[PDB]
Structure 1
């Protein structure tokens, strides 16, 4: 199970079961590039979010209804969608995954 393996390997099941998380099957440089693409509002009202012009191969990991810490368990859903990330700093880089659309 991809999500069980990746959520564990990436520390997302050690301190708590992260209920939902998205993985992006693209290069880091192509995700960092989104920070100079379409400027959009974030869910929180801040305007440091950026939407990719293109769709990207992504995987959504979501905890099952019965899952509980420490035995975290996930269902995997594939999608090809535009990403929205919050960007910050110098260099101006992704710091949060806001949504897929």
Structure 2
């Protein structure tokens, strides 16, 4: 079973690399993180930072969620992220993605005790 915090780590965290390792990164990671099992998830973002830096975002700038409610928070610093977006010829079960490297502020929704990131809302 996965708690919401554990699913956020599976869907959005990859501190094992400092940036997407090559143009094939989303094609491999979308499958290995199990995001393409039942359908091709069309967009997903991965965060290449320590989890401790991402959990601290929960006490930073409060903003409304784009979806949720207003329990979203935007990071003060920019972070190393990868955007994975399904390409035109992708079709389940052969999901294919374009990998884009970016350095942007992240916005996450946080919940619980301890109060941690449970959803990736957006990047700006």
Bucket of the pairwise TM-score, normalised by the shorter protein = over 0.9
Identify unmatched segments of 5+ residues in structure 1: none
Q: Confirm or deny: 8 A CA contact 2:67 2:121 kept in the other structure.
A: no
1:53 aligns with 76
Superposed displacement of residue 46, structure 1 = 1.1
Identify unmatched segments of 5+ residues in structure 2: 1-23
Q: Greater helix share, 1 or 2?
A: 2
Aligned length: 101
Q: Greater strand share, 1 or 2?
A: 1
RMSD over aligned Cα, in angstroms? 0.9
Q: 1:47 to 1:3 in 2, by over 3 A?
A: same
Higher mean alpha-carbon deviation, 44-53 vs 68-77, is at 44-53
TM-score, structure 1 as length reference = 0.96
Moved over 4 A (4+): none
1:63 aligns with 86
